[PDB]
Structure 1
Amino acid sequence: MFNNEPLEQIDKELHDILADEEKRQRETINLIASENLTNGAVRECLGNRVSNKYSEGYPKKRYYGGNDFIDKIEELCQKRALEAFNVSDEEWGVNVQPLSGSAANVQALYALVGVKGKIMGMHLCSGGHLTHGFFDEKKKVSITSDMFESKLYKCNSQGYVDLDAVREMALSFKPKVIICGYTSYPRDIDYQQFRQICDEVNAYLFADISHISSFVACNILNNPFLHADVVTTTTHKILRGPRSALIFFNKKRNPGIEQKINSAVFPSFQGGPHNNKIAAVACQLKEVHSPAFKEYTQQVLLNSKALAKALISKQIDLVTNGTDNHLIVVDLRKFSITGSKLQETCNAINVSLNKNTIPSDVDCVSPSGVRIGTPAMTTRGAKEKDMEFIADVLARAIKITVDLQEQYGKKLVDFKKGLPGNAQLQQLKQEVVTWAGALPFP
């Protein structure tokens, strides 16, 4: 007693928009540092009937029976995760149930410190995530600042994490957890120094590596598994999996931590797991542990270095003057245009990027930067040579943005009016669409 007609016959209205969405993705230069494109096999898992099953609990500790095949998939996923991140299952545990990055960080934080617990994290404005304790004078913006007591550490004026400030804060604040790994940080992290600071105050070390996870797995960047008690990551960014999260815990360092984490994910926060997510994650973790994926990750870094170097050749300033990873943050102060203005301009030319704060910024309204990344475009086959064109397109959009601002003024409402119909933008979009439309698309 069901309708088995395909999506196109069943809901033509919805199917058009999805096909529209498909066309926009394939015709866009996607520089969102956190975005990627999943392969058909990962999308087959996400559409699988495994999502039908309710399997509250953990493998071999299910509330319900009929979970034999589900248990194999959840165990296959945990093995592949520990393998991919070069950790021993005797020494490290992992939870595959968190639905997304934010849920996983909140669940993990709760496990470690509990309600009213004290946490330290990097500020959103300096490159931290919302789930790292972010609040504002006006509001406790994140649950992580409301169900926990949070202190926030700023990066220095050159955009690097300033450890002296971190230690100064840890000794005075005395938190139970200190979080590192960030949302818009273009450089590598000194985990060892974090581990040294955490010990002095007897606090846990929490590394959130969602943005750089692939780098850590393939040993191109510093390894937080050597020093951290907990490691969290999403699977949908540089890792190129579905939208999900992973929580790693150091049993050797903290016995009895497995129970706290596992009980935090369920039943403290979540109910039934999403089995299609888990199947999809397993599928990508196998790809992650192949010499080919290491190649791709290497390619992402090469493209990022080349992109940075080309932007600098065109007189564009980058925060910290470059990158050790997949992402770059452009300081736009010399051009006197805001990041929101450039983002608007870039949408008009089918270039996806995001406005981003810089060290000088005092407000999340009017940020002075944009953040770009290479993983999506690297997934689409762009090589080092292709980055000069991306940099050229961005330089042209900056100039166009300056021209329009000269013509209509700094008020964002007035600036947007200049955008529709602009000859140069229509031309620029056209070149963007023609090059973007050509590239391999999973």
Structure 2
Amino acid sequence: MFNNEPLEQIDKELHDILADEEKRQRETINLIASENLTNGAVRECLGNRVSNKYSEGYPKKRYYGGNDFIDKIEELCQKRALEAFNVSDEEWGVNVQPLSGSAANVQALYALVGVKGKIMGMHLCSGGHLTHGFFDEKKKVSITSDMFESKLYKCNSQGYVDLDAVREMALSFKPKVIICGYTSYPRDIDYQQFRQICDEVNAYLFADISHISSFVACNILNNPFLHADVVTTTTHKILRGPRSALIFFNKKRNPGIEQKINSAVFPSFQGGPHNNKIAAVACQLKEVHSPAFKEYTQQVLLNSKALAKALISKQIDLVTNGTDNHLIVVDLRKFSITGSKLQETCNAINVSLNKNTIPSDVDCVSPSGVRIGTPAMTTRGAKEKDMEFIADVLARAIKITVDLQEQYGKKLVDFKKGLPGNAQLQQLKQEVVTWAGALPFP
């Protein structure tokens, strides 16, 4: 007793905006480090009827039957995750039901520590995620700072993790979990030294590798699996999967972590799984293991190294003066402009990037940087030669921002008033749209 008209006919208002979004995405130099583009195969999963199914519990331990084919899919997804991260399904378990990275972290953290639980994570301003225990003085911003007791370590003035400060913190504060793996961190991680600090204080090692998952998979970067009790990743970023999360747990290092974590996901926090998510993670995970995806990951780093290089060739300062991964955080201080200002300037020329804090920063408001990353563009067929152009565009943006601030004022309200109608921005968007509009597009 339903309507079966396609989306164009059924809701013309919506289909318009979705085709507009398509065009915007197609005609953008997308530098959001956390973004990517899924193929049609993954979206065919997310669009699949497999999501009609309530399948609470676990495969072979459902509450309902009729989950014959769902069980197979959940199992295939777990088979492939551990396969793809080169871990033995005898030493490592994986949960494939978490709905997103933020849910997975909260869930996994709760499993290890529980309420009033003590956790250590990197501060937001230093490159840590909200779910790593973020608070301001006035408010416990993340549940992770509220349902848990959280202390936060900073990076040094040069933007690097200070393992010394972690020790000072870990030994005195004495937490049950220490979190490593970050949201805007341009360098690789010394996990082994984290393992060294965790042992010293009997803490669990939590590695959230959401930004760098593919590197870890493709053995391009350090392996946290060698040293960590839990590892969480999102699937929608560099892994180029759907929006979802995976929780990995070392059965060997702490048996009965399986039940602990499998129950945190359900019934502690979640209800029915989203099978279309699961089905899509399955789909992307097949691709992850292939040596073709390894080419793509290498390409991401090649592009990032080249981009960093090209930005430095133009007298632009980077934090840590470079990158080990897919991401660069530009320091804007020498230019006397905010990341807030530059983000707007880039939006006007169809350049997606986000503002970001740096180490000298004191507020999440008025931050002195932007964060770019290469996974999306790499996916669109861009190579190292193309990086000079993006660098060129970012430099021009920066110059135009400096000009517009001089003409309208350091006040953001004022500044944006200078943005529309501007001759050079229209010129630059145009060049951007020209080049962007014609690259490969899943």
Q: So what's the TM-score if we normalise by structure 2?
A: 1.00
Shift of 1:54: 0.2
CA distance, structure 2, for counterparts of residue 173 and residue 60 of structure 1: 42
Shift of 1:211: 0.1
CA distance, structure 2, for counterparts of residue 418 and residue 114 of structure 1: 51
Shift of 1:43: 0.2
Residue of structure 2 equivalent to 1:89 = 89
Shift of 1:399: 0.2
Please give the secondary structure, in 1, of the residue aligned with 2:437: helix
Shift of 1:177: 0.2
CA distance, structure 2, for counterparts of residue 291 and residue 104 of structure 1: 28
CA distance, structure 2, for counterparts of residue 67 and residue 366 of structure 1: 52
CA distance, structure 2, for counterparts of residue 68 and residue 191 of structure 1: 40
CA distance, structure 1, for counterparts of residue 218 and residue 253 of structure 2: 23
CA distance, structure 2, for counterparts of residue 358 and residue 368 of structure 1: 6
Shift of 1:200: 0.4
Give the 5 Å matches for 1:13-28: 13-28=13-28
Structure 1 residues 41-84: Cα deviation after superposition (integer angstroms, max 9, x where no partner) = 00000000000000000000000010000000000000100000
Please give the secondary structure, in 2, of the residue aligned with 1:226: coil
CA distance, structure 2, for counterparts of residue 136 and residue 218 of structure 1: 37
CA distance, structure 1, for counterparts of residue 362 and residue 423 of structure 2: 35
Shift of 1:14: 0.2
CA distance, structure 2, for counterparts of residue 124 and residue 310 of structure 1: 28
Please give the secondary structure, in 2, of the residue aligned with 1:370: strand
Shift of 1:24: 0.1
Please give the secondary structure, in 2, of the residue aligned with 1:199: helix
Shift of 1:103: 0.1
Structure 1 residues 371-402: Cα deviation after superposition (integer angstroms, max 9, x where no partner) = 00000000000000000000000000000000
Residue of structure 1 equivalent to 2:155 = 155
CA distance, structure 2, for counterparts of residue 9 and residue 411 of structure 1: 45
Give the 5 Å matches for 1:213-252: 213-252=213-252
CA distance, structure 2, for counterparts of residue 163 and residue 281 of structure 1: 34
CA distance, structure 2, for counterparts of residue 393 and residue 316 of structure 1: 13
Shift of 1:128: 0.1
Shift of 1:190: 0.2
CA distance, structure 1, for counterparts of residue 242 and residue 130 of structure 2: 21
How many residues get paired? Answer: 442
Please give the secondary structure, in 2, of the residue aligned with 1:189: coil
Shift of 1:370: 0.1
CA distance, structure 1, for counterparts of residue 128 and residue 38 of structure 2: 26
Q: So what's the TM-score if we normalise by structure 1?
A: 1.00
CA distance, structure 1, for counterparts of residue 210 and residue 133 of structure 2: 17
Shift of 1:165: 0.3
Give the 5 Å matches for 1:110-259: 110-259=110-259
CA distance, structure 1, for counterparts of residue 239 and residue 162 of structure 2: 28
5+ residue gaps, structure 2, are none
Shift of 1:308: 0.1
Shift of 1:189: 0.1
Give the 5 Å matches for 1:8-87: 8-87=8-87
5+ residue gaps, structure 1, are none
Identity %: 100
Shift of 1:268: 0.2
Structure 1 residues 325-356: Cα deviation after superposition (integer angstroms, max 9, x where no partner) = 00000000000000000000000000000000
Please give the secondary structure, in 2, of the residue aligned with 1:3: coil
Shift of 1:303: 0.1
Name the Cα RMSD after superposition: 0.2
CA distance, structure 1, for counterparts of residue 27 and residue 48 of structure 2: 28
Structure 1 residues 111-144: Cα deviation after superposition (integer angstroms, max 9, x where no partner) = 0000000000000000000000000001000000
Residue of structure 2 equivalent to 1:292 = 292
